[PDB]
């Protein structure tokens, strides 16, 4: 009587998933969000007088990924599907640039949000249909991790998040994570609890701990390998309309505590969203968290698109401005990494 | 209290009434809209190749014996050679259109090939479109296996099928479609009828708890399970009376009587075996829900056998189609 | 190939089913005669009677020896003392009940205790030694059990909380399985209090959630629904609701919540009636029965106030015995026929 | 904001965390001296000593009066009598313990009972009266509790079934919450027996399912993990397994199963061991500690065999006190050093 090999992730894949997961959530570093859609790229390119063409998107993302030494501060890069199959102007596959900097490619694989019937606009995350085939293709193209956004909200008067909300989120997250790992992708698990409301931080801690207990029990039920998975929740914070906002030390305290109360330490890392300005509250919050411990999980940042805002402004679509632009990107990347510690 | 917490009185009434009509006394559901390939096996006994849908739909009086018809999506938008939409022909007969909306099966990772049913993505939009085109019920098939040595059906299997069914059902009702819930427990294996009874009760308990959690209106839903039987390689086959007994017991043990009907899958049985089993079930006193057995395949079969591929036999082909529809229908009374 | 020890035996299943069917008779009801020494002290004081064991025996003899009472009473709840007690003329109480075909039963829980770190939400205690108690009670002639679980409705405080529901359903399932392991019919009692100003739609919602969880739990614990009974509260508005539901509304919602959650294998559903034929509960169950035939039998578990006028008529003095019994006989009668 | 009644207070949380941290000391272990009157009657009969309260008191006093014992002992399990016992010089046993910094605790469950219609799978009884017992125990000086749950592994029979796991988790979480509501640290004890021929991978799989369920339930019942301790079996092959695991494998899978399921807020995990320094468990725990620093402390809860040599050195002779204590001391020392 033994466990069948078909019931476990193989040695090869478990080692790959663990190694990649560990590299992606590096404390010195962060994930570059370079996955704007055509529609979002239009707004950005417009701000600098650049025409939104496929070729120019290739110029822009070559500008990002070919920045010499970026991998010292950037652990991974989120790509739009177009970019995953795209070559630079000089003929170099985007994934090859990333590889040259040791930056790990990833991609969003969900199909967005849909209201759960008979809830007060509480949301399910869709995308399981054809997800395995997508993950296979993506891995073959060079992606090594996935994203999948789930959303919960807090509203005590309306009983949010309802049981159904939490059940759905946990199930979707677990299915998506197992499917990812079946296709050799590290899943980034993302139960995002919105800050909408005037609840204070203790409420957010309570909700967070309940949601995370549920999510990890679900991950265990679906045979998800925590050693090859990552967690990206919101930090534990007061609601945006709370009249008594938490301090950075408090946010650090409650976030570390919720994680330690619910996250098994087999999970190698927990990441949080930062808007990529080194002085912003998310930086301060994470720095305060790192002052504590050290922890059973690596802490790291997933950077919003604004990280490369100045890079864009420096470049302006002008070839001659590449070096300058890339210099700027480095200094932002470095400074955000350093701000964590 | 509150507004968007409940199904409206209007919609709940429509769903309840349509579920009632679908699971009507003395009637069955016609399953004769079939694909290109699957009618090669069907044709090659009658030996014609390539109107048929017209032959099925233009059969006057069929509503007496047929409560619903299963259509493909394309058929919903299709018109008669006289410009009449197929769904308007079905409507004139009082026959309710329905459609299978799941996207088939996919292995649950790290299980021994137990299956998730796929198809929630875009499902709500599809359902809205189908209602607009005239569909009033939907069908979703989940599959589970029995294998005591391998712990099948596993907790993950049961959990996934219950989740997918409840999700599907809630979405259907959100788009004014009656959901037909089909948790199919395969008869593979050597287990006897007591094992199937035990598993069926566990599965249906999980499924109806999930349906409650997802706010599914039972009054506007329908259940389509296998009858409870011995496994196909079982050395001690169950009698008709035993099948009746354990099937009725499993249902009474797990299914709230707000559900208007239970319409059994053919499950690999003969038409007359299924008829006999249902008869033994009817012997077992009045039930809180309508019980039906499936026979669309047999109807389509004998109609095709009458047709033989010649345009001359149309009338005859329709007459027998009515006759058999009657015989099967009245067998359920 | 399922195995013997995984299911209630045929004989015991038959016994449980038959006793359950008998307990939930439509024209009849359960007599609540299980006053504690203290309660019975109170309303013995109400008629100037010294609360002694002998006088309690007099009183319950007077109840259970009413000739014909079995036409309107299907079961009787006893205090433990009474289960082992003889009438003053030497007849075992259970023998008196058996002569009238009245089935004896008894409460087996040990009351309520707050769930830690909840807002005063309650677990029902009583599982320790419960099996042994049921065995002995059966041995003494008991054939059904009672176990009160409590939940509250409070939207502002998220009540009933998931932990409340989970605890109640676990404890109920546990209790019921043990009962049946000792050949007792368990009366499953998830009582949802009427505290609050919520209207009837809120109570219907909560009742349906709670009952769904309860019956899933009963299934998880291998409980035989065929040999069990349910006694919930009727679905109603809150005691402080400004817009109260009507009798017809109450019937509609109660029947609907049951049909939406209770599997038909369950042979009966009982409700609390205060023992008067004209009160709200009677009219409610009446509207319920007017609403066509049901998968479950509907019945009444009468409160200790039913035999009150019998006690007033008795006044402890022996000469009134017959008289007292007459009163009882009519009372039950009036309460029986009113259900249908 | 969150209600203060929804959380363990700062003072109590701090007390629980500190006591838990002290109990799960890596260089130490828990002394088990909670024999009942019968058990101690057997152990005394082994060395020709009359089993009286006087002699029991002498024995307990000899154990707990060992000066310096607090170096290798962080806790002591007492039988209820011992908690209220005094030395011949009138010093409370718990005060002797306090002087050595050794923390007292007590087993509070009421043993196992078969879950109905299971193949003799066991529920743990003891929740009735548990809160009151815990309050009294704390008042007498108790600071931790023990509660043993038992599961088995049998693939052909589908053990541990869902009901077994569900029950174990429910009982453990209720008990944990009640302890913490009375300021006791609960040691949570989901014991998975080694009966069977399965190999270590099966045990690991089962352990991970069981622990996942236990910890979800601990969360559902608002159990403060910072003030709790876990005491599972090590992950090993079954006792009849033909292909036994190595010490390194046992360490690997045990550590893995814990890291896969146990949140790092839990200060420590303790395993069961005999009083033998070079026994399997000691080498296993040793192999575990070598696997770098862990998110929780690893420790030992010793069996009643630890003091067997002390008990034998005593010989019931008062003059033999001083030496016997040395025998315990040494016997403790090795056991502490064989862990790290």
PDB file of N, CA and C in Angstrom, chain D residues 285-330:
ATOM      1  N   UNK D 285      13.469  12.669  16.107  1.00  0.00           N
ATOM      2  CA  UNK D 285      13.406  14.084  16.469  1.00  0.00           C
ATOM      3  C   UNK D 285      14.762  14.734  16.262  1.00  0.00           C
ATOM      4  N   UNK D 286      15.809  13.975  16.560  1.00  0.00           N
ATOM      5  CA  UNK D 286      17.158  14.464  16.348  1.00  0.00           C
ATOM      6  C   UNK D 286      17.406  14.744  14.866  1.00  0.00           C
ATOM      7  N   UNK D 287      16.985  13.819  14.011  1.00  0.00           N
ATOM      8  CA  UNK D 287      17.106  14.001  12.567  1.00  0.00           C
ATOM      9  C   UNK D 287      16.286  15.189  12.077  1.00  0.00           C
ATOM     10  N   UNK D 288      15.159  15.438  12.729  1.00  0.00           N
ATOM     11  CA  UNK D 288      14.327  16.579  12.372  1.00  0.00           C
ATOM     12  C   UNK D 288      15.017  17.896  12.709  1.00  0.00           C
ATOM     13  N   UNK D 289      15.570  17.979  13.915  1.00  0.00           N
ATOM     14  CA  UNK D 289      16.187  19.224  14.359  1.00  0.00           C
ATOM     15  C   UNK D 289      17.377  19.612  13.492  1.00  0.00           C
ATOM     16  N   UNK D 290      18.041  18.610  12.923  1.00  0.00           N
ATOM     17  CA  UNK D 290      19.182  18.840  12.043  1.00  0.00           C
ATOM     18  C   UNK D 290      18.770  19.464  10.714  1.00  0.00           C
ATOM     19  N   UNK D 291      17.488  19.377  10.381  1.00  0.00           N
ATOM     20  CA  UNK D 291      16.999  19.934   9.123  1.00  0.00           C
ATOM     21  C   UNK D 291      16.797  21.446   9.215  1.00  0.00           C
ATOM     22  N   UNK D 292      17.778  22.139   9.789  1.00  0.00           N
ATOM     23  CA  UNK D 292      17.739  23.586   9.910  1.00  0.00           C
ATOM     24  C   UNK D 292      16.676  24.061  10.881  1.00  0.00           C
ATOM     25  N   UNK D 293      16.567  25.385  11.057  1.00  0.00           N
ATOM     26  CA  UNK D 293      15.576  25.984  11.957  1.00  0.00           C
ATOM     27  C   UNK D 293      14.156  25.835  11.418  1.00  0.00           C
ATOM     28  N   UNK D 294      13.211  25.498  12.292  1.00  0.00           N
ATOM     29  CA  UNK D 294      11.823  25.303  11.887  1.00  0.00           C
ATOM     30  C   UNK D 294      10.933  26.418  12.443  1.00  0.00           C
ATOM     31  N   UNK D 295       9.804  26.702  11.759  1.00  0.00           N
ATOM     32  CA  UNK D 295       8.831  27.734  12.145  1.00  0.00           C
ATOM     33  C   UNK D 295       8.161  27.485  13.495  1.00  0.00           C
ATOM     34  N   UNK D 296       8.390  26.307  14.067  1.00  0.00           N
ATOM     35  CA  UNK D 296       7.874  25.970  15.392  1.00  0.00           C
ATOM     36  C   UNK D 296       8.912  25.175  16.172  1.00  0.00           C
ATOM     37  N   UNK D 297       8.858  25.268  17.491  1.00  0.00           N
ATOM     38  CA  UNK D 297       9.730  24.465  18.326  1.00  0.00           C
ATOM     39  C   UNK D 297       9.308  22.999  18.266  1.00  0.00           C
ATOM     40  N   UNK D 298      10.292  22.107  18.300  1.00  0.00           N
ATOM     41  CA  UNK D 298      10.043  20.673  18.405  1.00  0.00           C
ATOM     42  C   UNK D 298      10.429  20.182  19.797  1.00  0.00           C
ATOM     43  N   UNK D 299       9.599  19.323  20.382  1.00  0.00           N
ATOM     44  CA  UNK D 299       9.794  18.893  21.757  1.00  0.00           C
ATOM     45  C   UNK D 299       9.241  17.491  22.020  1.00  0.00           C
ATOM     46  N   UNK D 300       9.288  17.073  23.286  1.00  0.00           N
ATOM     47  CA  UNK D 300       8.846  15.741  23.709  1.00  0.00           C
ATOM     48  C   UNK D 300       7.850  15.770  24.863  1.00  0.00           C
ATOM     49  N   UNK D 301       6.836  14.917  24.776  1.00  0.00           N
ATOM     50  CA  UNK D 301       5.988  14.614  25.922  1.00  0.00           C
ATOM     51  C   UNK D 301       6.297  13.183  26.354  1.00  0.00           C
ATOM     52  N   UNK D 302       6.988  13.042  27.482  1.00  0.00           N
ATOM     53  CA  UNK D 302       7.526  11.744  27.873  1.00  0.00           C
ATOM     54  C   UNK D 302       6.447  10.830  28.441  1.00  0.00           C
ATOM     55  N   UNK D 303       6.682   9.528  28.337  1.00  0.00           N
ATOM     56  CA  UNK D 303       5.770   8.540  28.878  1.00  0.00           C
ATOM     57  C   UNK D 303       6.062   8.275  30.340  1.00  0.00           C
ATOM     58  N   UNK D 304       5.196   7.494  30.977  1.00  0.00           N
ATOM     59  CA  UNK D 304       5.335   7.184  32.393  1.00  0.00           C
ATOM     60  C   UNK D 304       6.498   6.233  32.672  1.00  0.00           C
ATOM     61  N   UNK D 305       7.195   5.815  31.620  1.00  0.00           N
ATOM     62  CA  UNK D 305       8.360   4.947  31.764  1.00  0.00           C
ATOM     63  C   UNK D 305       9.630   5.742  32.080  1.00  0.00           C
ATOM     64  N   UNK D 306       9.557   7.060  31.916  1.00  0.00           N
ATOM     65  CA  UNK D 306      10.687   7.951  32.181  1.00  0.00           C
ATOM     66  C   UNK D 306      11.181   7.890  33.631  1.00  0.00           C
ATOM     67  N   UNK D 307      10.249   7.690  34.557  1.00  0.00           N
ATOM     68  CA  UNK D 307      10.557   7.712  35.978  1.00  0.00           C
ATOM     69  C   UNK D 307      10.621   6.308  36.560  1.00  0.00           C
ATOM     70  N   UNK D 308      10.603   5.307  35.686  1.00  0.00           N
ATOM     71  CA  UNK D 308      10.615   3.917  36.125  1.00  0.00           C
ATOM     72  C   UNK D 308      11.872   3.608  36.936  1.00  0.00           C
ATOM     73  N   UNK D 309      13.012   4.100  36.457  1.00  0.00           N
ATOM     74  CA  UNK D 309      14.293   3.894  37.124  1.00  0.00           C
ATOM     75  C   UNK D 309      14.375   4.687  38.428  1.00  0.00           C
ATOM     76  N   UNK D 310      13.758   5.865  38.445  1.00  0.00           N
ATOM     77  CA  UNK D 310      13.666   6.651  39.668  1.00  0.00           C
ATOM     78  C   UNK D 310      12.787   5.939  40.693  1.00  0.00           C
ATOM     79  N   UNK D 311      11.653   5.440  40.211  1.00  0.00           N
ATOM     80  CA  UNK D 311      10.712   4.693  41.027  1.00  0.00           C
ATOM     81  C   UNK D 311      11.374   3.459  41.631  1.00  0.00           C
ATOM     82  N   UNK D 312      12.235   2.814  40.850  1.00  0.00           N
ATOM     83  CA  UNK D 312      12.935   1.625  41.321  1.00  0.00           C
ATOM     84  C   UNK D 312      14.071   1.971  42.284  1.00  0.00           C
ATOM     85  N   UNK D 313      14.720   3.111  42.062  1.00  0.00           N
ATOM     86  CA  UNK D 313      15.786   3.562  42.953  1.00  0.00           C
ATOM     87  C   UNK D 313      15.213   3.982  44.306  1.00  0.00           C
ATOM     88  N   UNK D 314      13.983   4.483  44.281  1.00  0.00           N
ATOM     89  CA  UNK D 314      13.298   4.907  45.494  1.00  0.00           C
ATOM     90  C   UNK D 314      13.100   3.730  46.441  1.00  0.00           C
ATOM     91  N   UNK D 315      12.426   2.686  45.957  1.00  0.00           N
ATOM     92  CA  UNK D 315      12.252   1.435  46.703  1.00  0.00           C
ATOM     93  C   UNK D 315      11.324   1.646  47.915  1.00  0.00           C
ATOM     94  N   UNK D 316      10.649   2.794  47.949  1.00  0.00           N
ATOM     95  CA  UNK D 316       9.727   3.116  49.026  1.00  0.00           C
ATOM     96  C   UNK D 316      10.424   3.486  50.325  1.00  0.00           C
ATOM     97  N   UNK D 317      11.752   3.474  50.298  1.00  0.00           N
ATOM     98  CA  UNK D 317      12.552   3.816  51.464  1.00  0.00           C
ATOM     99  C   UNK D 317      12.851   5.310  51.474  1.00  0.00           C
ATOM    100  N   UNK D 318      12.464   6.001  52.557  1.00  0.00           N
ATOM    101  CA  UNK D 318      12.690   7.445  52.693  1.00  0.00           C
ATOM    102  C   UNK D 318      14.162   7.835  52.541  1.00  0.00           C
ATOM    103  N   UNK D 319      15.057   7.077  53.165  1.00  0.00           N
ATOM    104  CA  UNK D 319      16.488   7.358  53.080  1.00  0.00           C
ATOM    105  C   UNK D 319      16.982   7.329  51.636  1.00  0.00           C
ATOM    106  N   UNK D 320      16.259   6.613  50.781  1.00  0.00           N
ATOM    107  CA  UNK D 320      16.634   6.480  49.378  1.00  0.00           C
ATOM    108  C   UNK D 320      16.181   7.650  48.510  1.00  0.00           C
ATOM    109  N   UNK D 321      15.578   8.666  49.128  1.00  0.00           N
ATOM    110  CA  UNK D 321      15.096   9.829  48.378  1.00  0.00           C
ATOM    111  C   UNK D 321      16.194  10.479  47.536  1.00  0.00           C
ATOM    112  N   UNK D 322      17.187  11.044  48.221  1.00  0.00           N
ATOM    113  CA  UNK D 322      18.248  11.832  47.601  1.00  0.00           C
ATOM    114  C   UNK D 322      18.856  11.183  46.356  1.00  0.00           C
ATOM    115  N   UNK D 323      19.176   9.897  46.450  1.00  0.00           N
ATOM    116  CA  UNK D 323      19.794   9.190  45.334  1.00  0.00           C
ATOM    117  C   UNK D 323      18.812   9.017  44.176  1.00  0.00           C
ATOM    118  N   UNK D 324      17.572   8.655  44.500  1.00  0.00           N
ATOM    119  CA  UNK D 324      16.552   8.405  43.487  1.00  0.00           C
ATOM    120  C   UNK D 324      16.389   9.623  42.591  1.00  0.00           C
ATOM    121  N   UNK D 325      16.339  10.793  43.219  1.00  0.00           N
ATOM    122  CA  UNK D 325      16.243  12.052  42.494  1.00  0.00           C
ATOM    123  C   UNK D 325      17.385  12.175  41.481  1.00  0.00           C
ATOM    124  N   UNK D 326      18.606  11.864  41.916  1.00  0.00           N
ATOM    125  CA  UNK D 326      19.747  11.864  41.003  1.00  0.00           C
ATOM    126  C   UNK D 326      19.458  10.976  39.796  1.00  0.00           C
ATOM    127  N   UNK D 327      18.957   9.768  40.056  1.00  0.00           N
ATOM    128  CA  UNK D 327      18.620   8.829  38.986  1.00  0.00           C
ATOM    129  C   UNK D 327      17.642   9.458  37.998  1.00  0.00           C
ATOM    130  N   UNK D 328      16.687  10.231  38.511  1.00  0.00           N
ATOM    131  CA  UNK D 328      15.748  10.912  37.631  1.00  0.00           C
ATOM    132  C   UNK D 328      16.500  11.966  36.838  1.00  0.00           C
ATOM    133  N   UNK D 329      17.296  12.756  37.558  1.00  0.00           N
ATOM    134  CA  UNK D 329      18.031  13.872  36.978  1.00  0.00           C
ATOM    135  C   UNK D 329      18.802  13.425  35.743  1.00  0.00           C
ATOM    136  N   UNK D 330      19.724  12.496  35.962  1.00  0.00           N
ATOM    137  CA  UNK D 330      20.471  11.855  34.894  1.00  0.00           C
ATOM    138  C   UNK D 330      19.547  11.372  33.783  1.00  0.00           C
TER     139      UNK D 330
END
